[PDB]
mmCIF file with all atom_site columns, C-alpha atoms in Angstrom:
data_model
loop_
_atom_site.group_PDB
_atom_site.id
_atom_site.type_symbol
_atom_site.label_atom_id
_atom_site.label_alt_id
_atom_site.label_comp_id
_atom_site.label_asym_id
_atom_site.label_entity_id
_atom_site.label_seq_id
_atom_site.pdbx_PDB_ins_code
_atom_site.Cartn_x
_atom_site.Cartn_y
_atom_site.Cartn_z
_atom_site.occupancy
_atom_site.B_iso_or_equiv
_atom_site.pdbx_formal_charge
_atom_site.auth_seq_id
_atom_site.auth_comp_id
_atom_site.auth_asym_id
_atom_site.auth_atom_id
_atom_site.pdbx_PDB_model_num
ATOM 1  C CA . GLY A 1 1  ? -48.972 18.921 19.647 1.00 0.00 ? 265 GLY A CA 1
ATOM 2  C CA . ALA A 1 2  ? -45.958 20.605 21.214 1.00 0.00 ? 266 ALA A CA 1
ATOM 3  C CA . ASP A 1 3  ? -44.398 23.058 18.775 1.00 0.00 ? 267 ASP A CA 1
ATOM 4  C CA . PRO A 1 4  ? -43.978 22.882 14.970 1.00 0.00 ? 268 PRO A CA 1
ATOM 5  C CA . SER A 1 5  ? -41.398 25.658 15.228 1.00 0.00 ? 269 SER A CA 1
ATOM 6  C CA . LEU A 1 6  ? -38.727 23.077 16.138 1.00 0.00 ? 270 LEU A CA 1
ATOM 7  C CA . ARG A 1 7  ? -36.814 23.889 12.972 1.00 0.00 ? 271 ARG A CA 1
ATOM 8  C CA . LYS A 1 8  ? -34.741 26.803 11.747 1.00 0.00 ? 272 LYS A CA 1
ATOM 9  C CA . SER A 1 9  ? -38.023 28.578 11.022 1.00 0.00 ? 273 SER A CA 1
ATOM 10 C CA . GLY A 1 10 ? -39.009 29.047 14.656 1.00 0.00 ? 274 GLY A CA 1
ATOM 11 C CA . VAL A 1 11 ? -37.237 32.444 14.532 1.00 0.00 ? 275 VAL A CA 1
ATOM 12 C CA . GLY A 1 12 ? -34.156 32.907 16.633 1.00 0.00 ? 276 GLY A CA 1
ATOM 13 C CA . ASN A 1 13 ? -33.578 29.186 16.900 1.00 0.00 ? 277 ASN A CA 1
ATOM 14 C CA . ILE A 1 14 ? -30.114 28.255 18.116 1.00 0.00 ? 278 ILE A CA 1
ATOM 15 C CA . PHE A 1 15 ? -28.385 25.186 19.472 1.00 0.00 ? 279 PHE A CA 1
ATOM 16 C CA . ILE A 1 16 ? -25.871 24.998 22.311 1.00 0.00 ? 280 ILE A CA 1
ATOM 17 C CA . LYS A 1 17 ? -23.259 22.290 22.848 1.00 0.00 ? 281 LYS A CA 1
ATOM 18 C CA . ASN A 1 18 ? -21.081 21.254 25.794 1.00 0.00 ? 282 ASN A CA 1
ATOM 19 C CA . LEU A 1 19 ? -23.181 22.472 28.722 1.00 0.00 ? 283 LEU A CA 1
ATOM 20 C CA . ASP A 1 20 ? -22.669 21.706 32.400 1.00 0.00 ? 284 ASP A CA 1
ATOM 21 C CA . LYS A 1 21 ? -24.951 19.358 34.355 1.00 0.00 ? 285 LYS A CA 1
ATOM 22 C CA . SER A 1 22 ? -25.891 22.248 36.660 1.00 0.00 ? 286 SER A CA 1
ATOM 23 C CA . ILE A 1 23 ? -27.443 23.991 33.659 1.00 0.00 ? 287 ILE A CA 1
ATOM 24 C CA . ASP A 1 24 ? -31.240 23.846 33.685 1.00 0.00 ? 288 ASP A CA 1
ATOM 25 C CA . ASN A 1 25 ? -33.783 25.555 31.424 1.00 0.00 ? 289 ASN A CA 1
ATOM 26 C CA . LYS A 1 26 ? -33.796 28.325 33.944 1.00 0.00 ? 290 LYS A CA 1
ATOM 27 C CA . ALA A 1 27 ? -30.049 28.571 33.931 1.00 0.00 ? 291 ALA A CA 1
ATOM 28 C CA . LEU A 1 28 ? -29.922 28.613 30.143 1.00 0.00 ? 292 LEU A CA 1
ATOM 29 C CA . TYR A 1 29 ? -32.778 31.110 30.037 1.00 0.00 ? 293 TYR A CA 1
ATOM 30 C CA . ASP A 1 30 ? -31.205 33.202 32.791 1.00 0.00 ? 294 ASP A CA 1
ATOM 31 C CA . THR A 1 31 ? -28.029 33.640 30.762 1.00 0.00 ? 295 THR A CA 1
ATOM 32 C CA . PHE A 1 32 ? -29.371 33.908 27.188 1.00 0.00 ? 296 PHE A CA 1
ATOM 33 C CA . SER A 1 33 ? -32.422 36.029 28.148 1.00 0.00 ? 297 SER A CA 1
ATOM 34 C CA . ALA A 1 34 ? -30.030 38.963 28.626 1.00 0.00 ? 298 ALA A CA 1
ATOM 35 C CA . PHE A 1 35 ? -29.747 38.958 24.821 1.00 0.00 ? 299 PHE A CA 1
ATOM 36 C CA . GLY A 1 36 ? -33.488 38.812 24.279 1.00 0.00 ? 300 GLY A CA 1
ATOM 37 C CA . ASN A 1 37 ? -36.748 37.245 25.382 1.00 0.00 ? 301 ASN A CA 1
ATOM 38 C CA . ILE A 1 38 ? -36.959 33.486 25.045 1.00 0.00 ? 302 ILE A CA 1
ATOM 39 C CA . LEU A 1 39 ? -40.142 31.595 24.149 1.00 0.00 ? 303 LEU A CA 1
ATOM 40 C CA . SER A 1 40 ? -38.773 28.086 24.582 1.00 0.00 ? 304 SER A CA 1
ATOM 41 C CA . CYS A 1 41 ? -35.317 27.191 25.858 1.00 0.00 ? 305 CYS A CA 1
ATOM 42 C CA . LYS A 1 42 ? -34.332 23.629 26.692 1.00 0.00 ? 306 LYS A CA 1
ATOM 43 C CA . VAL A 1 43 ? -31.427 21.847 28.326 1.00 0.00 ? 307 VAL A CA 1
ATOM 44 C CA . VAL A 1 44 ? -31.659 18.209 27.509 1.00 0.00 ? 308 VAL A CA 1
ATOM 45 C CA . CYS A 1 45 ? -30.635 16.544 30.717 1.00 0.00 ? 309 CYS A CA 1
ATOM 46 C CA . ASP A 1 46 ? -29.090 13.166 31.424 1.00 0.00 ? 310 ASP A CA 1
ATOM 47 C CA . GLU A 1 47 ? -29.497 11.321 34.729 1.00 0.00 ? 311 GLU A CA 1
ATOM 48 C CA . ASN A 1 48 ? -26.281 12.976 35.987 1.00 0.00 ? 312 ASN A CA 1
ATOM 49 C CA . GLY A 1 49 ? -27.454 16.450 35.059 1.00 0.00 ? 313 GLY A CA 1
ATOM 50 C CA . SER A 1 50 ? -27.240 17.143 31.334 1.00 0.00 ? 314 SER A CA 1
ATOM 51 C CA . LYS A 1 51 ? -26.659 15.392 28.014 1.00 0.00 ? 315 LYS A CA 1
ATOM 52 C CA . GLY A 1 52 ? -24.355 18.210 27.079 1.00 0.00 ? 316 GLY A CA 1
ATOM 53 C CA . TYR A 1 53 ? -26.517 20.300 24.756 1.00 0.00 ? 317 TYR A CA 1
ATOM 54 C CA . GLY A 1 54 ? -29.395 22.754 24.770 1.00 0.00 ? 318 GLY A CA 1
ATOM 55 C CA . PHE A 1 55 ? -31.592 24.874 22.511 1.00 0.00 ? 319 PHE A CA 1
ATOM 56 C CA . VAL A 1 56 ? -32.916 28.464 22.575 1.00 0.00 ? 320 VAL A CA 1
ATOM 57 C CA . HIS A 1 57 ? -36.037 29.826 20.946 1.00 0.00 ? 321 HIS A CA 1
ATOM 58 C CA . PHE A 1 58 ? -35.604 33.581 20.842 1.00 0.00 ? 322 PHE A CA 1
ATOM 59 C CA . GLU A 1 59 ? -38.486 36.026 20.717 1.00 0.00 ? 323 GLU A CA 1
ATOM 60 C CA . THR A 1 60 ? -36.557 38.072 18.233 1.00 0.00 ? 324 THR A CA 1
ATOM 61 C CA . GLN A 1 61 ? -34.353 36.878 15.397 1.00 0.00 ? 325 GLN A CA 1
ATOM 62 C CA . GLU A 1 62 ? -31.667 39.449 16.215 1.00 0.00 ? 326 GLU A CA 1
ATOM 63 C CA . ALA A 1 63 ? -31.414 38.362 19.865 1.00 0.00 ? 327 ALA A CA 1
ATOM 64 C CA . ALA A 1 64 ? -30.530 34.883 18.656 1.00 0.00 ? 328 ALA A CA 1
ATOM 65 C CA . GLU A 1 65 ? -27.692 36.198 16.533 1.00 0.00 ? 329 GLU A CA 1
ATOM 66 C CA . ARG A 1 66 ? -26.394 38.041 19.609 1.00 0.00 ? 330 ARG A CA 1
ATOM 67 C CA . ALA A 1 67 ? -26.579 34.858 21.693 1.00 0.00 ? 331 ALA A CA 1
ATOM 68 C CA . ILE A 1 68 ? -24.569 32.995 19.069 1.00 0.00 ? 332 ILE A CA 1
ATOM 69 C CA . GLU A 1 69 ? -21.716 35.515 18.987 1.00 0.00 ? 333 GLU A CA 1
ATOM 70 C CA . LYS A 1 70 ? -21.818 36.333 22.668 1.00 0.00 ? 334 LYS A CA 1
ATOM 71 C CA . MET A 1 71 ? -22.221 32.873 24.219 1.00 0.00 ? 335 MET A CA 1
ATOM 72 C CA . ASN A 1 72 ? -20.246 30.741 21.790 1.00 0.00 ? 336 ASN A CA 1
ATOM 73 C CA . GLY A 1 73 ? -16.851 29.950 23.273 1.00 0.00 ? 337 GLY A CA 1
ATOM 74 C CA . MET A 1 74 ? -17.761 30.973 26.808 1.00 0.00 ? 338 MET A CA 1
ATOM 75 C CA . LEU A 1 75 ? -17.751 29.045 30.061 1.00 0.00 ? 339 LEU A CA 1
ATOM 76 C CA . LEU A 1 76 ? -21.067 28.335 31.602 1.00 0.00 ? 340 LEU A CA 1
ATOM 77 C CA . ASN A 1 77 ? -20.421 27.412 35.237 1.00 0.00 ? 341 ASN A CA 1
ATOM 78 C CA . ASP A 1 78 ? -17.379 25.397 34.199 1.00 0.00 ? 342 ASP A CA 1
ATOM 79 C CA . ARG A 1 79 ? -17.931 24.227 30.620 1.00 0.00 ? 343 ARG A CA 1
ATOM 80 C CA . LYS A 1 80 ? -17.311 26.108 27.401 1.00 0.00 ? 344 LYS A CA 1
ATOM 81 C CA . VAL A 1 81 ? -20.469 26.139 25.335 1.00 0.00 ? 345 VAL A CA 1
ATOM 82 C CA . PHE A 1 82 ? -20.871 26.230 21.593 1.00 0.00 ? 346 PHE A CA 1
ATOM 83 C CA . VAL A 1 83 ? -23.801 28.269 20.325 1.00 0.00 ? 347 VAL A CA 1
ATOM 84 C CA . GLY A 1 84 ? -24.775 28.209 16.682 1.00 0.00 ? 348 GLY A CA 1
ATOM 85 C CA . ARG A 1 85 ? -27.594 28.327 14.168 1.00 0.00 ? 349 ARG A CA 1
ATOM 86 C CA . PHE A 1 86 ? -30.209 25.629 14.629 1.00 0.00 ? 350 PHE A CA 1
ATOM 87 C CA . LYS A 1 87 ? -30.050 23.700 11.381 1.00 0.00 ? 351 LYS A CA 1
ATOM 88 C CA . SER A 1 88 ? -32.728 21.087 11.969 1.00 0.00 ? 352 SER A CA 1
ATOM 89 C CA . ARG A 1 89 ? -32.069 19.234 8.712  1.00 0.00 ? 353 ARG A CA 1
ATOM 90 C CA . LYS A 1 90 ? -32.774 20.681 5.271  1.00 0.00 ? 354 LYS A CA 1
ATOM 91 C CA . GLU A 1 91 ? -35.844 22.896 5.065  1.00 0.00 ? 355 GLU A CA 1
ATOM 92 C CA . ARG A 1 92 ? -36.799 25.572 2.546  1.00 0.00 ? 356 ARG A CA 1
ATOM 93 C CA . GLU A 1 93 ? -38.619 27.531 5.218  1.00 0.00 ? 357 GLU A CA 1
ATOM 94 C CA . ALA A 1 94 ? -35.895 28.585 7.640  1.00 0.00 ? 358 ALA A CA 1
ATOM 95 C CA . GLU A 1 95 ? -34.341 31.752 9.021  1.00 0.00 ? 359 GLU A CA 1
#
């Protein structure tokens, strides 16, 4: 498999919207890691650079909450990103 923690129960799971094409997993990690360790961050990239959204898996639950407050509404390289709680769908097991 890949990772069954791709829900809201992966601890510290957040989603980011409106990223710049120059944003890679490294770039996302480089910024958000300051809030806490990341196990699996991802910038879903289009041919031109990025589809305009990314995801963080934080080591710690609290670090994720920091990333949400701290990064939401900020400019990353040029584009203001929206960071929020990763609501995968509708699960009972979710934090």
